[model samples]
Target: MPSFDIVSEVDLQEARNGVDNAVREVESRFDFRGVEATIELNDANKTIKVLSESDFQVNQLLDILRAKLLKRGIEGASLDVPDEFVHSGKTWYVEAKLKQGIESAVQKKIVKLIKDSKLKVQAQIQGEEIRVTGKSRDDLQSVMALVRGGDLGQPFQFKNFRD
Candidate 1:
């Protein structure tokens, strides 16, 4: 069985490091000093929210996160930054949320794509992730390639294939 799973995940440790770095830089930068920037990654909730004095600073905080992932050899593309940054008085903030359970829309899209392609590939939604299997490893690999190249909206990492 040469199968793989698609998942959206982040490196908790890296996220922590990013926050530390962001805090440190904020303190040292004269412009940012005492401007009030807060970053919290709630693993239990699978969410990250940042509060800053301005959108520029909020973007800097996000840059820290993306840099951390890049430093760890992860793609910046994998980190999906949500839209909707709210500005309340002098404070600007943003929140990002992730779902751990089944992304039905994406699952259906994958299935539909495969069926339409008529590639003899089978895909199923299991809980939060998707499982794709096929007799031809090459076909499976091609499918993986195709899906990877497409914009599935949320991030996806294909894994777990036993032939």
Candidate 2:
């Protein structure tokens, strides 16, 4: 059988580096001078928390973080940013979660896509990743092409290709 695994994963090291770069830029930027703004990345929580005096400043922080992440080859869509900020006393903050793994809903959608494409491949939901297998390697390749073309909101990586 020819098979491949589709998973949504990010390089945490790159993400951390991006956050470091963003923090450095924030410190050096004139607008951020004397500003009580901070960006922190929590590896355990898999989140990036941006704190500032106002919503506008928080948005600016998010923009800078996203640009740095993008430069580090991370898709901006991988961040689950909320529409509203959390205001606690004098500080406004936004905790953006880093999205990873293929959820059940997305797994079903991917399976449906493979089935609808009329390709002779089977997509199985295995935990956080999807395993796609077929008798022919060509069919498996086609499935990869189809998935890459589809917009699933989050970024996906194809791995563990076996023949």
Candidate 3:
């Protein structure tokens, strides 16, 4: 069978580089010269925390961070603003998380979409990735085309195809 895995993932190393460079820029910018700010990247938590004296500055930090991510070829949609900055005495803190892999609901939707397309392919959920296999190579190509054309609400990559 010809098969491939569809997954949503961001290379942690590149993401780290983006966060580091963006934070450095925030620290050096004259506009932000006096305002205290902190951008922390937690790999284990897969989270980015931005702390600043004002909400506006924190948002600016997020903008620069997103620009860095875009420059690195990662989709901006991968970032989720789960909550706004919380007041901490004299500073504001915001939390952003980089989401990888489809959630269960989305995974189900992807499988259903593939099945509805009526192609000669079977899509199975394997851990965090979706494995799709078919006897005909053309069916695989069609599946790719369909997925590329369809809007599934998240970025997906087709990789590791086997025949």
Candidate 4:
């Protein structure tokens, strides 16, 4: 059987590198001078904490961070920005979460996609990922192309191909 896994994951090292470079860029930018701006990534918690003088500044930093992530080969959708922020006194704080798995609705849609496409493959939802198996590698390839072409509103990686 030819099989592969559809998963959403972040390369922590690459993420760290992106954050480091973005922070370095922020440090050197003249607009950030004399302004309190800080971005912290807590790997253990899978969260990014941003502190700035104002909410607008925080949003600006987030844009820079997202651009750096793309430059490092990470998808923009991999960063989840909820419609929420915190303001304590004069400091603006916001947290951006790292998206690592498909939501239930998206997962269901993927399974439905595979089933409705009438491809000669079986797709099973396995916890945070999906496993696809088919009798022929070519069928599997077709399924991959189909899924990749669809707009699932998030990025997914196909890996662990096996015969």
Candidate 5:
């Protein structure tokens, strides 16, 4: 049997490095002079916290973070960011949540896609990953092409292929 696993995972260390770069940019930018702003990545919560004196500044911080993340090979879809800022007294902030694993809905869609393709491949949901098995490696390759062509929101990685 030939098999492979499809999963969505993020490199937290890369994300942390991106955030650090964003922080440095904020500090050096002229427009941010004398502004009380900060960006921090919470590893436990898997969220990036952005704080500033005003809502506009917070939005700018998020833009910088997004650019840095993109430079670090992370797509925008990997983050669940709020459209509005949270204001508390004189401070405004936003928490951009990270999406790491494949959701149940996405898993079901992948399995259904394999079945509908009629490619003689069996796909099963295993926790946050989908295991796809077929008698021939050619069928498995087709499955990979099908998945890569689909837009299921999250980024997918093909791994652990075995024969």
Candidate 6:
């Protein structure tokens, strides 16, 4: 079976590294030294929580996170952020939730795109992932390219390639 699986997954180790780098930098930075701040990555919860003195500080923290993730080869688009930071007491909280797995809406969109393209491939949505199979390896490759080039609204990783 010449096929591949299109899945949205983040590298846990890389993410942790990114968070660590961000934390180290934030903790020592002059501006942050006076302000109380803490950044934590909850892999099991798939969320990166940032606690800082104010909204401005939280935004700065988020910028550091994005930069760190980018430098680590993780796209900034992989994170889903709220429009505004949340305030709890004197501190502001910003949760940079990692987007993993294909949502039902996105899965349907991908399947529709493949079907409308009239390609010789079968796309099956299995739980949180999508399995795409085709007879021709070239067809599968083309489908891969098509999906990669499109604005799927989130980051995707293609794996489980078998021919």
Model 6 lDDT at residue 90: 96
Q: What is the lDDT of candidate 1?
A: 0.72
Model 3's alpha-carbon lDDT is 0.84
lDDT for each residue of candidate 4 in 1-163, tens digit (9 for 90 to 100) = 8899999887788889888988999999999999998888889766788889898999998998899889988889889886877989889989987777777888998888889889889998898899999998988888888788888878889999999
RMSD of each: 2.7, 1.5, 1.9, 1.9, 1.9, 1.5
lDDT of 3 at 54: 88
- Tell how far residue 130 is off in model 1, in angstroms: 0.7
Error of 2 at 63 (Å): 0.8
Against the correct fold, how does model 3 do in TM-score?
0.88
For candidate 6, the lDDT comes to: 0.89
lDDT of 4 at 109: 88
Of models 2 and 4, which has the larger TM-score?
2
lDDT of 1 at 79: 58
lDDT of each: 0.72, 0.90, 0.84, 0.87, 0.89, 0.89
> Number of the top candidate by lDDT?
2
TM-score of each: 0.80, 0.92, 0.88, 0.87, 0.87, 0.91
lDDT tens readout by residue for model 1, 59-157: 988787567556764466555577769999999988755434446777787777777778877887788778888888998988877777777665567
State the lDDT of candidate 6 residue by residue for 87-151, as single tens digits. 98999998888877888988988998899879889999988889999999989988888888879
Q: Show pairs that collide, candidate 1.
A: 1-162
Tell me which residue pairs clash in candidate 2.
Answer: none
Comparison by lDDT, 1 against 4, better one: 4
Tens digits of lDDT, candidate 3, 1-163: 7899888898888889999989888878999887888778899877899888988888898899889888887678888765667988999888887877877887888887789999889998898888999999899888878776777777889899899
